[PDB]
């Protein structure tokens, strides 16, 4: 399939040589290759897109990124620097590249203003945030976005009518020490990533974010970070036990997955899991994505192009869902 | 289908009735009925079994159980007390009721001896443990069982050749405060339970427990506590990235699910997820279970009895897999 | 779920006392209740709709119906009689009942004119035809609609922009005797029905009906009459073998199922097969239906309402697909 | 996966090479290659097996084969010729090649005697028959095997305890004229094949063949010739409607699929349909198959080797179900010449 759209696609700031090499060494068997590709915006990245039937990618800042920065002024300065950098870096290829906003999430009003700045000025397509904001004087705390103090931010997101991609981050601080340090091969894609995002997303559900902000679109990578596996079980326990005991969110978990939540295929090129999600989530709410350069184009795209599924859903998941959700202009081979 | 076998089926101690009823306020819409049913062994429990086609259930101590007790002497005494209690309580129904061992997991040698004691004396079918053992100052510490100090325990488990059921427990202490207190509707079946068990089970995988103890059978409830959903993703990251970087476990995740792991249908009466698991896990390693009394018999058994799947797999999952695994 | 739409729902003419008795003797355990329910249009049928959350049903003439009549003038007269009868019988329930055209398919131009007559005069939502038209002396011949001479009829269907539901018919004549008489319990839903419809519908594909008429919408019951089970196998043999050897289809079989074909859940209340069809066909092309009164409302509707599937597709399949495809107005 | 076993794998007689090459013009893009490969037993065939991880194949006579021959004496003589031919042709490779019996099915006792002859003398693994036997004048009649006169045959099959593979055959004669001549692109794999076998197999079910012969094992290719798609629909209509009206078979359709029927993956390299069949049929009754040379080894084996399903079911379907059902030699894989 030509003209696919992918949107969990990372870049790094070239000056961050040590940080990029550190993350590369934890996520890639060839870390110098990883570094070259996460730094490149317009050369190898577009050659891969041309080679593998990808018309358009929406770029986002690497994890942990700004969500690792616990000093609010340093975090804000890095978010601004990243946003200005990537807007300029993609300027030559508006037919191939868009960007998501990078945000410091220490303060709701500040994040709202920066999101508004770069969506309005640069035409960014939404925001991508690496789960909770690392915080505290020494980086031991974390900020979730499901409390009412974030209403001023979520109302900006819905006023702009752009999605928010809730990406994972590595575990840090006392949580890292107590749960993960002694089984550290589970940090990242094997388990820790999905546990963080699913906690936060279901926090958004059960703490009323989607009730207060019913137009809000939240995107989850990796086929939904475990959640569809338990769609039956979560729904049974919410509807039959937790709501009788006081849970007051207005809709069912299935209704939130129909109206507010999306899942992507990033890093999860599983035909069997995708077929399962056709039932539990539905092709209208599933988006192709790669997770480049943590994943390579060939793996994602040979898998997707090879899917022996119906042509309507293959087109929707491959590009047409994203074209409508992100209001995309005509892009290469759209 | 008649003669079904279920094995994530809880009881509590009668002397804890008030405590039991207090805690039931968070997960039972009728806490008085929940306390009555969890304390009952041979009356209502067997009546439900007879009415819903359950020939045999293996009973286990309710969560958090002994894993909530951070004083080692008190924990050990309670495990002993519970094991003797349930052996005596079920003794008149050998054809309908078995038991899993209850253990204090503060000390590997201590836990191995108590497991050996009750398996040999009472014919218990295995052990069931509610995830990590609370310990340390004020019970804020957590004991996982994937470190080398637990080899002496796992060696006793395989010597006895009985399975070990890794059951969830609620988050406690500072972890509870940091992650769950502000989104507490997610505590239990909605999310926290599976996050705990999958962390611990995949710690056993990656820290080599099944390589040092290849006979070991670990049973997971709730269709595998998220793990089968990511069978492809875990496998890809383990084989293609983590092992080249240094991960040293000898088998693939799929190989551990064929040799060492089992999943049950407890609290997960999902034809959709079960079908997905038929491909990713396989009918030979899936066991029916209920999670009574947090779940009721009618929900679990109406679902399973109505499953429109092939005859041979339905019988394997409903009873024959468990008959052979636990040698009933 | 409330407001469901069903559209493989049959009626008979009340004067046909014996032809209803015969058909019921093969496919119904209570011939009395069957006759009473297939004859009813506004009473027990709306009672069932009210008890089971069905907002609207599109009614169609029983099988084999007009396709059993090999005398063209008797066949055309029955299609006219049926079309006037049902349009009258449903007129006081426009928020609950619609109708498909009944057609004699002896002649493309004749059938076209009658379809245009009843769509224009009564607002019928399409046509429903019970597979091939019996023809010739004794009625042993069969008229298929995939030849170029049917272009004027399919051109009418796409001009009116209404769907054509290709319903099964029993096996008759020499074919019945040679293949079905000595294994007659397979006649109908067990096997014969799907073998007829799949032959005809795949005839339309490979003889170019959808290439000449790209806007044409054909609806198949019973989750597609076996075809989705072989979507991979048909696709492989068409693309890799039949097309190098002459098959001139512009599109793949999957593309025709995306653009021209639909399937319904009539008489196939199988969660297993539906889930499989979400992959092979897709929720946008699947329609709830019952096959009343051969099936009862309770079986179809307790199954559908109970489906533990995503909310978007449950709404689309249950009602919203049909609302858009049949340009249904406000109803409940 | 090495050591895979396939068993819908055809050959033709060399003396028919010109007729074979002609007919391949309709179902092979390179009919010269098709004729060369369907006529070869030990060279290219085994080379493909070596290259693609196939340890063992059971060979059978191509369709329509003896079922096309409506003179009973000619058909019997051909079946005998074919059986002696293939037994001799495969005899040096017992760890790579087995054979199914080829039968004339004009007369039950004659067919039973030939099946017994070649199972006993040659160690054939079962029978493979291309649906109904052409009979009568002009060969326009059809002999089905679900009537009571075939009981003597099915008792021989269960006494020998070998399976019977019910393979398709092209439509012929008047049925071909009436239904398929004007939509000839549906003849074969696209539709006609499955319609024939499913009618015949469900005739066996509803006419009580598996009640009179409960040990009988019938194998269906192409993931069951449509039938599992309608497992729910067939079961509902059998149990709730047709049995009250007089259908007298004793078990459900699911019970026959657990006890008497097998399906193979021949010509149906569909992860989607296979997964569906895991639920409706179960991995214990599913067998890998290729349908060579109509299908090529690369298509079947790259698909099967790439399947991301649980290890145990993959081994059962790929070889272990067949190793037990057809009593393959222990250590046969030591001869697999794997690359
Ligand atoms: Zn990522
Ligand atoms: Zn439990
Ligand atoms: Zn009907
Ligand atoms: Zn074949």
Determine how many CB atoms are found less than 10 A away from the CB of residue B325.
19
The answer to whether B231 touches B173, Cβ cutoff 8 Å, is no
Cross-strand bridge partners of residue D101:
D127
- Two structure tokens written together for B98: 């078995």
Q: Is A86 helix (H, G, I), strand (E, B) or coil?
A: helix
The answer to whether B325 touches B45, Cβ cutoff 8 Å, is no
Distance CA C56, CA C5 (A): 5
Residue C185: its chain D contacts at CB < 8 A? 206, 238, 242, 246-247
Site of tokens 């006037």: C84
Considering only alpha carbons, which residue of chain D is nearest residue B257? D310
Q: At what angle are helices A192-206 and B192-206 packed, to 10 degrees? A: 180
Count of positions (residues) in chain C: 332
Distance CA C25, CA B88 (A): 62
- Quick check: A275 and D272 CB within 8 A? yes
Distance CA C310, CA A257 (A): 8
- Two structure tokens written together for B263: 């999943």
Determine how many CB atoms are found less than 10 A away from the CB of residue B191.
27
Determine how many CB atoms are found less than 10 A away from the CB of residue C74.
11
Considering only alpha carbons, which residue of chain D is nearest residue A273? D308
Query: Whose CA is closest to A45, among A82, A99, A81?
Result: A99
Min Cα–Cα distance to chain B from D315, Å = 12
Reported as half-sphere exposure (CB side, CA atoms, 13 A), residue C118 has a value of 30
Distance of CA A243 to the CA centre of its chain: 29
Query: Whose CA is closest to C68, among C129, C7, C117?
Result: C129
CB-based burial label for D246 (10 Å; 0-12, 13-18, 19+): exposed
- Two structure tokens written together for A66: 């700004």
B1-328 placed in CATH 3.20.20.140: yes
Indicate which ligand has the atom closest to the C-alpha of A300: 1
- Quick check: A278 and C278 CB within 8 A? yes
- Two structure tokens written together for D81: 């010729």
Label residue D65 left, alpha or beta by phi (over 0 means left) and psi (-120 to 50 means alpha).
Answer: left
Distance CA A259, CA A240 (A): 22
| Torsion on CA atoms B166, B168, B174, B175, rounded to nearest 10 | 90
Min Cα–Cα distance to chain A from C309, Å = 5
- Quick check: B270 and C308 CB within 8 A? yes
Active site members of D: 249
| Torsion on CA atoms B271, B273, B279, B282, rounded to nearest 10 | -80
Strand pairing class (C4-11; A54-61): unpaired
Distance CA D187, CA D170 (A): 7
Backbone phi, psi, residue D206, to 5°: -70, -25
How many Å lie between the centroid of ligand 4 and the Cα of residue D232?
A: 27
D1-339 placed in CATH 3.20.20.140: yes
Distance CA D329, CA D166 (A): 25
- Quick check: B226 and A231 CB within 8 A? no
The CATH fold assigned to A1-334 is: TIM Barrel (3.20.20)
- SS3 annotation, chain B: CCCEEEEEEEECCHHHHHHHHHHHHHCCCCHHHHHHHHHCCCCHHHHHHHHCCEEEEEEEECCCHHHHCCCHHHHHHHHHHHHHHHHHHCCCCCCCEEECECCCCCCHHHHHHHHHHHHHHHCCCCEEEECCEEECHHHCEEECCCCHHHHHHHHHHHHHCCCEEEECCCCCHHHHHHHHHHHHHHCCCCCHHHHHHHHHHHHHHHCCHHHHCCCCCEEECHHHCCHHHHHHHHHHHHHHHHHHHCCCCCCCHHHHHHHCEEEECCCCCCHHHHHHHHHHCCHHHEECCCCCCCCCHHHHHHHHHCCCCCHHHHHHHHHHHHHHHCCC
How many Å lie between the centroid of ligand 4 and the Cα of residue B21?
A: 66
Query: Whose CA is closest to D26, among D182, D157, D136, D188?
Result: D188
Indicate which ligand has the atom closest to the C-alpha of A27: 1
Q: Which positions ≥6 away from B215 have C-beta within 8 Å? A: B158, B161
- Two structure tokens written together for C286: 């699947």
Count of positions (residues) in chain B: 328
- Quick check: D271 and A309 CB within 8 A? no
Active site members of C: 249
Distance CA D217, CA D162 (A): 7
Backbone phi, psi, residue A324, to 5°: -80, -45
CB-based burial label for D73 (10 Å; 0-12, 13-18, 19+): exposed
Distance of CA C161 to the CA centre of its chain: 17
Residue B308: its chain C contacts at CB < 8 A? 270-272
Backbone phi, psi, residue D300, to 5°: -70, -40
How many Å lie between the centroid of ligand 4 and the Cα of residue D203?
A: 21
How many Å lie between the centroid of ligand 4 and the Cα of residue D189?
A: 9
Indicate which ligand has the atom closest to the C-alpha of A193: 1
Min Cα–Cα distance to chain C from A51, Å = 24
Domain range C1-332, CATH class:
alpha beta
**Complete DSSP assignment for D272-297:** HHHHHHHHHT-GGGEE----TTTS-H
Q: Residue ranges per domain, chain B?
A: 1-328
Site of tokens 């070239």: A14
CB-based burial label for C15 (10 Å; 0-12, 13-18, 19+): exposed
Facing D278 at nearest CB: one of B254, B279, B311: B279
Output DSSP code: residue A317: I
Site of tokens 């594909």: C205
Determine how many CB atoms are found less than 10 A away from the CB of residue A332.
15
The answer to whether D25 touches D311, Cβ cutoff 8 Å, is no
Query: Whose CA is closest to C63, among C112, C100, C118?
Result: C100
Site of tokens 């078979």: D249
Site of tokens 């018919």: C169
Q: Which positions ≥6 away from C120 have C-beta within 8 Å? A: none
Facing B267 at nearest CB: one of A175, A231, A233: A233
- Resolution in A, one decimal? 1.5
Distance CA B179, CA A132 (A): 11
Query: Whose CA is closest to C282, among C259, C308, C301?
Result: C259
Q: Is D36 helix (H, G, I), strand (E, B) or coil?
A: helix
Determine how many CB atoms are found less than 10 A away from the CB of residue B298.
11
Query: Whose CA is closest to B176, among B295, B11, B26, B31?
Result: B26
| Torsion on CA atoms C27, C29, C34, C36, rounded to nearest 10 | 150
How many Å lie between the centroid of ligand 3 and the Cα of residue C188?
A: 10
Distance CA D218, CA A116 (A): 68
Strand pairing class (D133-135; D141-143): antiparallel
The answer to whether D317 touches D3, Cβ cutoff 8 Å, is no
Site of tokens 């990372």: A10
**Complete DSSP assignment for A96-111:** TEEEPBP---S-HHHH
| Angle, CA C187 vertex, CA C181 and CA C189 arms, to 5° | 170
Query: Whose CA is closest to A269, among D288, B240, D313, D317?
Result: B240
Strand pairing class (C141-143; C133-135): antiparallel
- Two structure tokens written together for D68: 């096309």
Query: Whose CA is closest to D118, among D103, D139, D137?
Result: D103
Q: Is D179 helix (H, G, I), strand (E, B) or coil?
A: helix
Distance CA A156, CA A66 (A): 20
CB-based burial label for B151 (10 Å; 0-12, 13-18, 19+): middle
Determine how many CB atoms are found less than 10 A away from the CB of residue B116.
15
Which helix (H) or strand (E) segment holds residue C143: the answer is strand C141-143
Query: Whose CA is closest to C118, among C85, C75, C83, C155?
Result: C83
Backbone phi, psi, residue B129, to 5°: -135, 135
Residue A308: its chain D contacts at CB < 8 A? 270-272
Residue B312: its chain D contacts at CB < 8 A? 258, 282, 284-285
- Two structure tokens written together for D129: 């028959």
Output DSSP code: residue C67: G
Considering only alpha carbons, which residue of chain A is nearest residue C272? A279
Determine how many CB atoms are found less than 10 A away from the CB of residue D109.
11
Q: At what angle are helices D17-24 and D31-39 packed, to 10 degrees? A: 140
Angstrom distances, CA of residue D220 to CA of D167, D200, D286: 7, 11, 10
Mutation for testing the C interface, residue in D190, D210, D234, D302 having most C CBs under 10 Å: D190
- Quick check: D29 and C241 CB within 8 A? yes
How many Å lie between the centroid of ligand 3 and the Cα of residue C10?
A: 7
Site of tokens 């092939």: B310
Residue C308: its chain A contacts at CB < 8 A? 231-232, 235
Distance CA D219, CA D201 (A): 10
Site of tokens 């945030």: A129
Q: Which subunits count as partners of chain D given 3+ CB pairs below 8 Å? A: A, B, C
**Complete DSSP assignment for D52-79:** TTEEEEEEEEPSSGGGG--SHHHHHHHH
Give the residue numbers in D contacting A (CB under 8 Å), as ranges. Answer: 270-272, 275, 308-309
The answer to whether B119 touches B128, Cβ cutoff 8 Å, is no
Q: Is A6 helix (H, G, I), strand (E, B) or coil?
A: strand
Which helix (H) or strand (E) segment holds residue D160: the answer is helix D151-160
The answer to whether A24 touches A31, Cβ cutoff 8 Å, is yes
Site of tokens 């993609």: A90
Cis before C293 (ω within 30): yes
Output DSSP code: residue A323: H
- Two structure tokens written together for B190: 């909605």
- SS3 annotation, A254-295: HHHHHHCEEEECCCCCCHHHHHHHHHHCCHHHEECCCCCCCC
The answer to whether D6 touches D267, Cβ cutoff 8 Å, is no
Cross-strand bridge partners of residue D27:
none
- Quick check: A311 and C254 CB within 8 A? yes
The answer to whether D133 touches D111, Cβ cutoff 8 Å, is no
Where helices occur in A17-176 by DSSP H, the ranges are: 17-27, 31-39, 44-51, 72-89, 108-122, 151-160, 173-175
Please state how this structure was obtained: X-ray
Strand pairing class (D261-264; B97-99): unpaired
How many Å lie between the centroid of ligand 4 and the Cα of residue C229?
A: 18
Strand pairing class (A54-61; A4-11): parallel
Q: Long-range contacts made by residues D239-246, C-beta under 8 angstroms, separation at least 24?
A: D240/C29, D241/C27, D241/C28, D241/C29, D242/C185, D242/C190, D244/C29, D245/C25, D245/C26, D245/C29, D246/C185
- Two structure tokens written together for D338: 């794997």
Site of tokens 């090459």: D21
The answer to whether B264 touches B281, Cβ cutoff 8 Å, is no
CB-based burial label for B51 (10 Å; 0-12, 13-18, 19+): exposed
The answer to whether D13 touches D82, Cβ cutoff 8 Å, is yes
Mutation for testing the C interface, residue in B277, B299, B303, B308 having most C CBs under 10 Å: B308
The answer to whether C197 touches D231, Cβ cutoff 8 Å, is no
Min Cα–Cα distance to chain B from A133, Å = 13
Distance CA A249, CA A68 (A): 31
Cis before A293 (ω within 30): yes
């Amino acid at each position: 399939m030509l003209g696919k759209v992918a949107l969990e696609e990372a870049f790094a700031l070239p000056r961050h040589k040590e940080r990029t090499r550190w993350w590369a060494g934890l996520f890639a068997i060839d870390p110098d290759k990883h570094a070259a590709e996460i730094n490149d915006i317009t050369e190898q990245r577009i050659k891969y897109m041309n080679e593998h039937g990808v018309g358009y990618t929406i770029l986002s800042y690497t994890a942990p990124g700004v969500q690792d920065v616990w000093d609010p002024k340093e975090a804000q300065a890095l978010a601004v620097e990243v946003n200005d950098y990537i807007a300029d870096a993609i300027k030559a290829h508006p037919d191939r590249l868009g960007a998501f906003a990078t945000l410091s999430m220490h303060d709701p009003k500040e994040a709202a203003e920066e999101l508004r700045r770069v969506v309005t000025k640069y035409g960014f397509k939404g925001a991508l945030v690496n789960d909770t904001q690392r915080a505290g004087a020494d980086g031991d705390d974390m900020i979730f976005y499901d409390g009412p103090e974030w209403d001023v931010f979520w109302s900006t997101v819905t006023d702009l009518d752009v999605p928010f991609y809730l990406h994972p981050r590595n575990p840090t601080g006392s949580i890292h020490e107590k749960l993960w340090a002694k089984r550290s091969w589970l940090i990242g894609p094997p388990l820790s990533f999905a546990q963080g995002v699913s906690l936060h997303a279901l926090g958004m559900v059960t703490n009323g974010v989607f009730d207060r902000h019913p137009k809000l679109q939240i995107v989850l990578g990796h086929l939904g970070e475990h959640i569809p596996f338990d769609m039956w079980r979560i729904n049974h326990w919410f509807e039959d036990i937790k709501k009788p005991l006081g849970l007051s969110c207005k809709l069912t978990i299935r209704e939130y997955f129909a109206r507010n939540l999306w899942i992507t295929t990033s890093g999860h090129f599983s035909t069997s899991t995708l077929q399962f999600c056709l039932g539990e989530v539905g092709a209208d709410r599933i988006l192709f994505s790669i997770d480049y350069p943590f994943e390579n184009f060939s793996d994602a795209c040979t898998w997707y192009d090879g899917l022996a599924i119906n042509d309507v859903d293959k087109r929707k998941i491959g590009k047409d869902n994203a074209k409508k959700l992100f209001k995309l202009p005509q892009f290469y081979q759209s």
